[PDB]
Each structure stands twice: as structure tokens, then as C-alpha cells.
Amino acid sequence: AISQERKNEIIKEYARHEGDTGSPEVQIAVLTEDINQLNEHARTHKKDHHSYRGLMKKIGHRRNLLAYLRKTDIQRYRELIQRLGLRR
Amino acid sequence: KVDYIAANHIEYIDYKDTELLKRFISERGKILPRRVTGTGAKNQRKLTIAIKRARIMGLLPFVSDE
């Protein structure tokens, strides 16, 4: 839902080298922006059951990528989840 | 039978050029099928939206007997 300038704005600060659109940092940060905006839209339109499906699938994708990042490098994982403000 | 919207290379329909629209409606005002006019699948969707737009803005009759 975020514009195409917000997206590049936030993938230019979780990159690692240049040209770095992959790298699970980028993907979970952009997914976090999406999930926040969709939560807003749901609070407003709470009987849009057909958009809630997409919300839930984004949440599944993010949790999966987090599991991957943890199982391979705990330092990057901790530093991220501090920087991004989650892990309740 | 050639798609007259493909005769010219016409990009937009504009629902205002009631001269072009008026050849897809019968002698009573009803929309003619994609067969009797030989147009394509998507140009037909655009044409239908065009004349439905026209009828509302009073450029074109819904029914025409009186």
C-alpha cells in the first residue's frame, strides 16, 4: 500500500551493500510498513474480510523470514529486532 | 467485418463523441452484440461503458419511441 517513494526510502537504509533489495532485513522492514498500514485500513473498514486474507499472508511471510535470519546469524537478528521495534 | 475501433488507431472513447457511439446502438437505442458489429472483447467493454455513460448525461436516449 505504501507509495513507491516510501518503499525506496526505506530500502535505502536497511541495505547492506549497494544494490541490495534482497537481504531479509530489507524484506521484513518493507513488510512491516505494509502490515502497519493495513492494520489502519482494517480498523477503519473492519468488515473487509477479503483484505484481511492478504494481511494474514503478509504476517506469515514476515515470521518465516525472521525464523530464517535467526537460525543462521543471531547477531544480525538481535540487532534488527532492536532497530525495528517488535518482539513483544 | 473489421473492428472499426481498430480501423483507426483510436485510443480513447470519451463517451462524448456521440457520432462514433451512435453506430453501435440499434434503431431503437439498444446495444448491439459483439457479433452483429464484429468488434473485439475489450473494445466492447469500453464501448458499453461509453454509451452507459452517455445515457446518464442526457446525450443519448434510454428508450426512443415518442
Binding site: - | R53, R55, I56, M57, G58, L59, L60, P61, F62, S64
Partner: protein, 97 residues
């Protein structure tokens, strides 16, 4: 960027030629006060209609050309004021591309 619209309304036929200019300028203003960059405003033609709307079988068509960001509360203001007037009969706002 922005989005482009085309507003098209139908004025009453039997008005004079100064209330008409007053109306046109009025709605240009009240479009612009909400951040709607108007970029064209014309008369079109005098036509008869295919059915009578209120009691009228003629009317004067006027079209405007306007861009704005998609969230500005401008183009709804036109609606809300136009459906309570006495000289306009119909309007159609339409995204243009």
C-alpha cells in the same frame, strides 16, 4: 503525483449572460480554495436533450479540467454544492487518463 479529472455539468438554459459568468467563476474559486489546480474551463455547445430532466429539454454544457492529489477534499465539495444549486441540472466527475 496527482490525478486528473474532467467535470461536466449542465446549466439551466433560460438564464442571462452575467449570472452564467458569476456561476462559472464561483465554482472555479471554490475548486481552487481546496488545492485543486484548474487547468481549463470552457463552454461547449447548446444542445437539446433526449429526455426532459426537471422540465427542461435544452441546456448548456460546460467542461473543466483539473488535477489534484487523490486525497484532497476538493472534488467532493463540488458535488456537495452542485446538488443543491438551482441552475445546474447534472454533473459527472470522471478520472481522466
Amino acid at each position: 503525483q496527482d490525478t486528473k479529472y474532467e467535470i461536466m455539468y449542465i446549466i439551466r438554459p433560460n438564464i442571462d449572460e452575467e449570472a452564467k459568468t458569476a456561476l462559472v467563476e464561483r465554482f472555479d474559486t471554490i475548486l481552487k480554495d481546496n488545492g485543486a489546480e484548474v487547468i481549463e474551463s470552457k463552454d461547449w455547445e447548446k444542445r437539446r436533450l433526449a429526455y426532459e430532466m426537471n422540465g427542461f429539454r435544452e441546456g448548456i454544457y460546460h467542461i473543466v479540467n483539473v488535477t489534484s492529489p487523490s486525497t484532497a477534499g476538493a472534488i467532493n465539495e463540488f458535488d456537495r454544492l452542485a446538488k443543491i444549486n438551482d441552475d445546474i441540472i447534472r454533473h459527472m466527475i470522471v478520472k481522466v487518463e
